RNA sequence: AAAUUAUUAUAUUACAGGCGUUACAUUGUUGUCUUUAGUUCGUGCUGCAAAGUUUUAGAUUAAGUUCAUAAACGAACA
C-alpha cells in the first residue's frame, strides 16, 4: 500500500510469471499517469491481454518459494 | 392442317414377385453388462531424451457425495 505496488500471501500459482497469459490474462489492468491516477481511458484488448511483469520482487520466505 | 399430342385398354420384353438362403456380409432398432471427476488440446515446468507433470495410496459421503491440495494453470467436451 505504501509503495503503490502488490503481494500476494496466500499462494504462488506456479507459472505466474512464466505462463501468465493462462492465469493473470482474464485479471483487469488500467493505465495510470506519472502521479498513479487512473486515466480512466478504456484499454484496447491488445493491451489487456499482454504479460504485466514485476520489476522486482521479494521474496519473504524463499526457502518455500523456489 | 388428316396428321400430331393426352388419356385409356390390349399386346410386346426387359422384368415384376419371392415370409427362398445368409443377423457370422448389412441399415436401423433393441437386450445385457460393464468403464463413464474421465479423455484430448493449449500453455508452463522437469528429464540429454523416449517420457513425466509429480502433493496423493488427500479428506469426506451410501455414493462425485462434498471439499481441500500440489509446477502446474486453463479450455473443451464425458
Ligand atoms: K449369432
Ligand atoms: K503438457
Ligand atoms: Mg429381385
Ligand atoms: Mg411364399
Ligand atoms: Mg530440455
Do not use: F
Amino acid at each position: 500500500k505504501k509503495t503503490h505496488g502488490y503481494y500476494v500471501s496466500t499462494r504462488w500459482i506456479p507459472g505466474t510469471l512464466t505462463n501468465s497469459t493462462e492465469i493473470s490474462g482474464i485479471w483487469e489492468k488500467q493505465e495510470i499517469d506519472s502521479n498513479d491516477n487512473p486515466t480512466e481511458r478504456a484499454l484496447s484488448p491488445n493491451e489487456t491481454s499482454k504479460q504485466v511483469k514485476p520489476d522486482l520482487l521479494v521474496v519473504l520466505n524463499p526457502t518455500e518459494n523456489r
